[PDB]
Design a protein around this nucleic acid. Structure first.
Lengths: 178, 537
DNA sequence: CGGCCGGGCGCCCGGCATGGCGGCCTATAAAAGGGC
DNA sequence: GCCCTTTTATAGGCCGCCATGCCGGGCGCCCGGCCG
C-alpha cells in the first residue's frame, strides 16, 4: 500500500439559475477578463482559495484549480456572491464535482517498456510522442500517466477514494517492474 | 543623455522600493538646486501616471508631489457611468480631461496627481495675474468649487471594484476621496456648506470619509453639518448590504474620536446600533463583521464611551459588558479569517480595559472556547492571536486570585486535557476526537470538521503538530498559574499520557511538562515530573 | 664553414548560393464541464 | 478548434544558419639546396 496520493486539481460546475450579461461583469470587476472571439466566458479569479471561474452567459460556471472539496465549494459560493453583488439575481444551485486529479511519487524508477508489453490491453506507449505511459483502468474509471521517474498522476476521478483505489490497484504492477 | 533621463527611468525600472525612493529624493533635490526647470522634470514624470503598473503610478505621484513641494507658493498680488497665471494650469487641465477616460488606470493616476498637486499648492489655485486680490480670491474659490464638484461627480458615477479579496476595493473611489480631502483644506466654510449640501446626508460614504476628517475642528459642533453625518452613518450601519456596512464602519473608525467628542448623547444610540448590527449573525461570506468589531474596539477604547456604557446598564444588566460581549463569541469560528482575527483582537482590547468590568465576562466559557480555537485553528496569525489572548485572559484572571482561576477552569480542565493530549494518526486512517468535548458558542455540545476528525491527508501533519504544541503551551501556562494542591487531575492526566500506547500523546505530555516547567516562577516547583522523564530517556 | 640562396606550399583573398546539419520550440498526453 | 485548471516531461520537424566551394593573385614561412 504505502504512500498516499496528493490531490492537485478539482473541477466543479454550479448553476446560478439566471442569465448574465458578460460584458457588464467584465467592465465592472477588476479580476475579470472577457474576449468573445477567443472564448465565450468571463474568467474571474479570487485569491482565497486560489481558483478560477469560467462564468458563461447561460448561468453555468466551471470552477477549477482547488485542492480540496471544501475549498472548491467555498470558492463557488464566493463567485456566486460576486455575481450577486454586480446586480444579477444569481442563486447557488446544482453543485457537483466532475473531475479530481491526483499525483504521487513512488521512490523507484519504472521499466515502462516491459509494463507496456505485459499490460498492452490496458495501456498505450509511444515514447516518440509523449515520455509517459498511459494506463486506463476500467473498474474505478481512472486514467493514470506513468513516468520513468517513478511519478504517477491520476485523473478522471469524481471522489477521493477513486484515486486511492486506483493507486492501490496499480502499485503492485509498478513494484513488479523495478 | 543627461542625468535626468536616467534618473526618471528608475521610478519604473527600479529594482527595489528604496532605489525608487532615492530616485524621487534625488529628483526633488534637483528641482531645489535648479528651480528654473520644473517643467522639464514634470513633462518626463507625468506620462507615468497613465502607465498600467500600479507601483509606477504611485511612485510617479509621489515624485510629482515632492518635486512640486520645492517650488515657491503662488501669490501674484500684494450621467455617463465611469466603467473600465496658475503655473500648473495645463498640468491640472490634462489631469482633469482624462479623469473621465474609459481606462481606469488613467483615472487612478489623474486622481493621485491632482491630490499631490493640490496638497501643497491648493491655496493659490485659479488666480490670474493682473486681477485684484479679492477677485483672485473669488476665482480661487471658483476653482476649488469646480474641482470638488468634478471629483464628487466622479465619485457618484464610478462602479469599478475589485473582488479578488473578501473586502471589496474601489481604487478610483478611494483616490477621488483622498483628492476631496486634499481640496477641502483650503476652501472657506461657505464652500464647505455647499459640499455638505451636495453630498446630502443619506445612504458617498467614502466621500463622507474625507468631506469630514478635513477642517475637522471647525465642523465639530457646527449644527446640522455635524448632526446629519451621525444619522447617515447610523443608517449605513443598519443597512442590509455588507458593502455599505463595511464602508461605513471603516469611515467612522478614524473619525470615532471626534464623533465621540461631538456629543455624549449620541454615544448611546451609536453603541446601541453597533451592538445591534453585530448581534445579528451576518452572512457567512461577509468580511464586514471585522470592520464592525474594529469600530467597536476603537469606540470602547475611549474613556467617555466606557462611562456611557457603564451608565447604560441603569435599570438592568442587558446593556452591560457581561451580557453583550458574548455576542462576539459566535464569530470566533467564522469562515473568513479576517472575522476571526477581528474577534480575537477586540476581545484582547476588552480584556485590557480594566476598570473592574472585565471580571464580569471573564469566566470558564471564554477560556474553553479559546482553547478550542487553539486546537482547531489552521491559520498562523489567528493561532498566534488566540494564544496571546489566552495568555492575557489567564493573567488577568490570576490577577484577582489564583484560586479564582483554579476553580473557574476546573469545570473545563479535563476535556481540554483530553484534547491537548490527543494522538495523531496516519493519512488514510485518522484517529478522530470526540465531538462532545467541543462546546458551541451558545450550546453545551458541538467548518472545523477536518481538524476534529484528525484527517492528516486533508490538513497537513505540520498543522496538527502545531496545534498540539500551541495547546501544550496554553495548558502548561494555566497549570503554572493555578496552585499546586489543585493539580492532581492535571498531573495524573499527563502521567497516564506518558505511558500511553500512542506515540503522539507521549510527545504532547512531554511538551506540556516542558511548558509548565518553563512558565513556573522557579524550576524547582515542577520537580515531581523528574523521574518519569528519566524513565522516558 | 658560414652565409646567401632559390624553392615549394600552406594561408588568405573573394564572389554567389546551395545543401546538411542544427538548436529550439510547440505539440504531445490525460480527465471534465461549459458555449461557440 | 477553442478554452480553464493541474503534475508529469522529452523528442521529433521546422525554420534558420553555415561552412562549403574554386580559379588566379599575392605574401611568408620553412625546407631543401649550393657558392667562393
Amino acid at each position: 500500500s504505502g504512500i498516499t496520493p496528493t490531490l492537485q486539481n478539482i473541477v466543479a460546475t454550479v448553476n446560478l439559475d439566471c442569465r448574465l450579461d458578460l460584458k457588464t461583469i467584465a467592465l465592472h470587476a477588476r479580476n475579470a477578463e472577457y474576449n468573445p472571439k477567443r472564448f465565450a466566458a468571463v474568467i474571474m479569479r479570487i485569491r482565497e482559495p486560489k481558483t478560477t471561474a469560467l462564468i458563461f452567459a447561460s448561468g453555468k460556471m466551471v470552477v477549477t484549480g482547488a485542492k480540496s472539496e471544501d475549498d472548491s465549494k467555498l470558492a463557488s459560493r464566493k463567485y456566486a456572491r460576486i455575481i450577486q453583488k454586480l446586480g444579477f439575481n444569481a442563486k447557488f444551485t446544482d453543485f457537483k464535482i466532475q473531475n479530481i486529479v491526483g499525483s504521487c511519487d513512488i521512490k523507484f524508477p519504472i521499466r515502462l517498456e516491459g509494463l507496456a508489453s505485459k499490460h498492452h490491453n490496458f495501456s498505450s506507449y509511444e515514447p516518440e510522442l509523449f515520455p509517459g505511459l498511459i494506463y486506463r483502468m476500467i473498474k474505478p474509471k481512472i486514467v493514470l500517466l506513468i513516468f520513468v521517474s517513478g511519478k504517477i498522476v491520476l485523473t478522471g476521478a469524481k471522489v477521493r477514494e477513486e484515486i486511492y483505489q486506483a493507486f492501490e490497484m496499480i502499485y503492485p504492477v509498478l513494484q513488479d517492474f523495478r | 543623455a543627461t542625468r535626468l533621463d536616467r534618473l526618471v527611468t528608475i521610478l519604473e525600472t527600479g529594482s527595489t522600493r528604496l532605489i525608487r525612493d532615492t530616485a524621487v529624493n534625488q529628483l526633488a533635490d534637483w528641482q531645489k538646486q535648479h528651480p528654473e526647470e520644473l517643467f522639464n522634470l514634470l513633462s518626463r514624470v507625468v506620462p507615468y501616471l497613465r502607465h498600467k503598473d500600479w507601483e509606477t503610478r504611485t511612485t510617479a505621484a509621489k515624485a510629482i508631489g515632492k518635486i512640486i513641494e520645492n517650488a515657491p507658493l503662488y501669490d501674484p498680488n500684494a450621467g455617463r457611468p465611469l466603467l473600465r497665471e496658475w503655473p500648473f494650469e495645463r498640468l491640472c487641465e490634462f489631469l482633469k480631461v482624462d479623469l473621465f477616460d474609459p481606462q481606469w488606470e488613467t483615472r487612478h493616476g489623474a486622481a493621485m496627481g491632482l491630490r499631490e498637486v493640490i496638497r501643497v499648492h491648493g491655496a493659490g489655485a485659479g488666480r490670474r495675474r493682473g486681477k485684484t486680490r479679492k477677485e483672485n480670491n473669488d476665482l480661487n474659490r471658483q476653482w476649488l468649487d469646480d474641482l470638488a464638484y468634478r471629483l464628487l461627480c466622479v465619485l457618484m458615477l464610478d462602479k469599478f471594484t475589485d473582488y479578488s479579496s473578501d473586502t471589496s476595493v474601489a481604487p478610483i473611489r478611494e483616490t477621488v476621496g483622498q483628492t476631496l480631502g486634499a481640496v477641502l483644506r483650503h476652501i472657506s466654510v461657505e464652500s464647505v456648506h455647499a459640499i455638505y449640501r451636495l453630498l446630502y446626508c443619506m445612504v458617498g460614504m467614502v466621500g463622507l470619509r474625507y468631506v469630514v476628517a478635513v477642517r475637522k475642528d471647525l465642523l465639530l459642533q457646527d449644527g446640522d453639518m455635524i448632526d446629519g453625518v451621525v444619522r447617515c452613518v447610523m443608517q449605513g450601519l443598519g443597512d442590509i448590504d455588507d458593502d455599505v456596512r463595511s464602508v461605513s464602519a471603516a469611515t467612522l473608525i478614524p473619525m470615532a474620536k471626534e464623533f465621540v467628542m461631538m456629543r455624549r448623547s449620541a454615544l448611546d444610540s451609536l453603541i446601541n446600533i453597533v451592538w445591534e448590527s453585530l448581534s445579528n449573525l451576518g452572512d457567512d461570506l461577509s468580511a464586514s463583521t471585522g470592520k464592525i468589531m474594529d469600530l467597536l474596539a476603537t469606540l470602547c477604547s475611549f474613556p467617555e464611551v466606557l462611562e456611557a456604557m457603564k451608565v447604560s446598564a441603569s435599570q438592568d444588566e442587558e446593556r452591560s459588558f457581561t451580557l453583550l460581549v458574548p455576542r462576539l463569541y459566535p464569530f470566533l469560528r467564522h469562515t473568513i479569517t479576517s472575522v476571526r482575527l477581528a474577534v480575537l483582537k477586540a476581545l484582547m482590547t476588552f480584556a485590557n480595559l480594566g476598570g473592574e468590568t472585565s471580571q464580569g465576562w471573564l469566566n470558564g466559557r471564554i477560556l474553553r472556547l479559546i482553547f478550542q480555537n487553539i486546537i482547531v485553528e489552521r491559520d498562523q496569525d489567528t493561532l498566534n492571536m488566540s494564544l496571546e489572548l489566552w495568555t492575557t485572559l489567564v493573567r488577568r484572571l490570576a490577577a484577582r486570585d489564583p484560586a479564582i482561576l483554579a476553580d473557574e477552569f476546573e469545570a473545563h480542565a479535563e476535556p481540554m486535557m483530553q484534547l491537548a493530549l490527543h494522538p495523531i494518526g496516519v493519512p488514510r486512517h485518522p484517529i478522530p476526537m470526540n465531538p462532545a468535548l467541543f462546546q458551541k458558542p451558545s450550546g453545551g455540545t458541538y467548518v472545523d470538521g477536518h481538524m476534529i476528525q484528525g484527517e492528516v491527508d486533508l490538513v497537513g501533519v505540520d498543522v496538527l503538530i502545531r496545534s498540539r504544541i500551541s495547546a501544550a503551551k496554553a495548558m502548561g501556562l494555566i497549570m503554572s498559574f493555578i496552585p499546586t494542591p489543585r493539580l492532581a487531575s492535571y498531573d495524573t492526566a499527563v502521567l497516564q499520557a506518558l505511558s500511553s500506547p500512542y506515540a503522539s500523546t507521549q510527545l504532547a505530555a512531554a511538551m506540556v511538562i516542558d511548558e509548565y516547567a518553563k512558565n513556573c516562577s522557579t524550576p524547582e516547583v515542577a520537580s515531581r515530573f523528574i523521574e518519569p522523564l528519566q524513565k522516558i530517556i
